Each structure stands twice: as C-alpha cells, then as structure tokens.
Design an enzyme around this catalytic site. Structure first.
Site, PDB file in Angstrom:
ATOM      1  N   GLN A 123       6.968   7.465 -10.426  1.00 28.03           N
ATOM      2  CA  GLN A 123       6.248   8.557  -9.728  1.00 28.03           C
ATOM      3  C   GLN A 123       7.056   9.081  -8.529  1.00 28.03           C
ATOM      4  O   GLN A 123       6.747  10.198  -8.101  1.00 28.03           O
ATOM      5  CB  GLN A 123       4.883   8.065  -9.252  1.00 28.03           C
ATOM      6  N   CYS A 176      -1.560   0.093 -13.646  1.00 32.11           N
ATOM      7  CA  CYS A 176      -1.758   0.131 -12.170  1.00 32.11           C
ATOM      8  C   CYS A 176      -3.025   0.969 -11.936  1.00 32.11           C
ATOM      9  O   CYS A 176      -3.973   0.799 -12.737  1.00 32.11           O
ATOM     10  CB  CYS A 176      -0.484   0.641 -11.490  1.00 32.11           C
ATOM     11  N   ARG A 226       4.008   2.095 -10.926  1.00 35.27           N
ATOM     12  CA  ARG A 226       4.352   0.647 -10.963  1.00 35.27           C
ATOM     13  C   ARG A 226       4.468   0.201 -12.426  1.00 35.27           C
ATOM     14  O   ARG A 226       5.391  -0.543 -12.743  1.00 35.27           O
ATOM     15  CB  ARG A 226       3.310  -0.186 -10.216  1.00 35.27           C
ATOM     16  N   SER A 227       3.561   0.639 -13.282  1.00 34.21           N
ATOM     17  CA  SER A 227       3.573   0.307 -14.723  1.00 34.21           C
ATOM     18  C   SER A 227       4.912   0.743 -15.343  1.00 34.21           C
ATOM     19  O   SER A 227       5.490  -0.028 -16.176  1.00 34.21           O
ATOM     20  CB  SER A 227       2.397   0.955 -15.428  1.00 34.21           C
ATOM     21  N   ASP A 269       0.857  -1.214   0.000  1.00 34.30           N
ATOM     22  CA  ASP A 269       0.000   0.000   0.000  1.00 34.30           C
ATOM     23  C   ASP A 269       0.885   1.255   0.000  1.00 34.30           C
ATOM     24  O   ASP A 269       0.543   2.172  -0.743  1.00 34.30           O
ATOM     25  CB  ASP A 269      -0.985   0.004   1.178  1.00 34.30           C
TER      26      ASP A 269
END
Ligand SMILES: O=C(O)c1ccc(-c2ccco2)s1
Length: 282
Positions: free
Chosen positions: A262, A215, A221-222, A181
């Site tokens: 990110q 994602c 994450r991608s 998370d």
C-alpha cells in the site's frame, strides 16, 4: 547481493516513491463486477478494495457466493495464498465457511482488532476455552483448544466443526501482534521469525488448502507476507538466485488482487525482509 545493491542505489537516491508509483502505473486492472453488486455492499469493508472476478473465492452456497477474498496462485514457486479482508460482524460466518470449503490448515492475522482507536476487524475467534462460538448462518462451531503468547506473536490451536456432518479439523491461528500503528517495523527480524514459524507448521505446504492471510484491507501487510515468502522460495529453487526480481514478483501477484503493498515504506520493508531472510539462508 544484487537486490541489496538495487536497494542501496534507491536509498542513496531517495527514489522509493518513484519506484512505487511505477509499480502502481504498470499494475493489472481486471473487472470486479460481483464485488460491486448492491446485494454485496455490507460484505465489503472498504469501497476501493475489491476482489477481481477471475480470481475471487466462491462460497459453496446458492443464495450468495460472495466474499471479499482472492486466490493468489504462484505457478513457478508452487505456492497458493488466499488474501482476504478482516472479517466484518456480518461476514464472520462466511470467513469460517471459506476456511472449511478451501481445506486451509492456517490463518495468518497481521493486525490487532483495535488500532489507532478504531475497530480494524471483528473478534472472529473465541478468547476462552469454555466459551465456544457458533455461526448459525453457516452451521459451524469454533473452540479455542490452546494459546501460546510470545513477545512478537501468538499461536492458537482452534477446532472447527461442520455441525452438518460432525467432521472436525484443527486450524492454527498465527497472530502477528507487534506491527506498529504507523509505518513499518524498523528491523524485519521479528517478521521473518514469524514467517518461519508459519512455514514450520505445515500451513503453507501443498498437502493442505491455501493459507488464509488478512490484515484490515488484506492488501498491505498481507501483501508483504506473501511477497517475502515467494521471493525467498524462488531464491532456493532457481539456479541463479540473483535473477529474483521483487518488482516482477509483485506485479505477477497484482494480477490476482489489487493494491498489494500500500506504501513506498512497505515496498522498502519487503526488500529488507527478502534481503535479510536471504542473507540468513546464505
Ligand atoms: O545476488 C546474489 O548474490 C544472491 C541473492 C540471493 C541469494 C540466495 C541464495 C540462497 C538464498 O538466497 S544469492
């Protein structure tokens, strides 16, 4: 290993935030005019994440061709990826239309439907064999064929039927279910194991359309997934593997979709993965 050296230098100097901001400063800026049309407001999950016009995937319909999805074409590595947002309640039918029209074999999902107590994407695939999904807007049927649940990921076999022509195709769903998370995984071992399973399936191979990766926003994450894959592929291709510059691959990828990677922790994790995966092929 050079990357592992540049790595230890940034770690000892604690300059991850400074490297990351230099990338943000040098990243490409191209127009996103179609994304920002008023007719497309409910087709976008996040106001600040849009596909560039030059690289956006077009739906094959005259009504509205818009989806929040980009084609990342890596010329030297000879790989293509479609990076897209988690589908919204009103874009699940568009998502499967895109998979159909682009001839993709695989979908890679790097998020849970719920995280931090909020919905990060729609429940866009069927959870039971005998309860298939029909998308009336795009004239598609999706059926769960089989499910293989492991400790770090789940693989599903799906059948996608074009109800217009009655052709069917097998789509593989690769669902990484253990990204935490907050922050990034402590070891890249389970993420690399997952990447190797996607590769083994044929989903990344040139006899198919591009893999679809998402994602929640389709940039964080991608971005980590397609950056690690491409860097490892270049390392096996080039005569001097040491010449692979992860920051330069990332800026190349950012010509096709904004915001890939990110956070400074995602950048560090990308290094670790490419370092660990490389240190494993050696
Ligand atoms: O700087 C160095 O020594 C290397 C970096 C990557 C390498 C590799 C060889 C095969 C796959 O990765 S060697």
């Amino acid at each position: 290993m050079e990357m592992e050296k540049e790595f230890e230098q940034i770690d000892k100097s604690g300059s991850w935030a400074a490297i990351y901001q230099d990338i943000r400063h040098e990243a490409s800026d191209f127009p996103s005019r179609v994304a920002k049309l008023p007719k497309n407001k409910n087709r976008n999950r996040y106001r600040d994440v849009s596909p560039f016009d030059h690289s956006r995937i077009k739906l094959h319909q005259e009504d509205n061709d818009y989806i929040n999805a980009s084609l990342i074409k890596m010329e030297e590595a000879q790989r293509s990826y479609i990076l897209t947002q988690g589908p919204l309640p009103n874009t699940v039918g568009h998502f499967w239309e895109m998979v159909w029209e682009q001839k993709s074999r695989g979908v890679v999902m790097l998020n849970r439907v719920m995280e931090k107590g909020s919905l990060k994407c729609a429940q866009y695939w069927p959870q039971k064999e005998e309860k298939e999904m029909i998308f009336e807007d795009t004239n598609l049927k999706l059926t769960l064929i089989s499910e293989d649940i492991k400790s770090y990921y789940t693989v599903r076999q799906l059948e996608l039927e074009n109800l217009t022509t009655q052709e069917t195709r097998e789509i593989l769903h690769f669902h990484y279910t253990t990204w935490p998370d907050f922050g990034v995984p402590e070891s890249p071992a389970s993420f690399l194991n997952f990447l190797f399973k996607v590769r083994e399936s044929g989903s990344l191979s040139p006899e198919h359309g591009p893999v679809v990766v998402h994602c929640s926003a389709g940039i964080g994450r991608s971005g980590t997934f397609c950056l690690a894959d491409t860097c490892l592929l270049l390392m096996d291709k080039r005569k001097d593997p040491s010449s692979v510059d992860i920051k330069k691959v990332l800026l190349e990828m950012r010509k096709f979709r904004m915001g890939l990677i990110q956070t400074a922790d995602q950048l560090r994790f990308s290094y670790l993965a490419v370092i660990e995966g490389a240190k494993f092929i050696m």
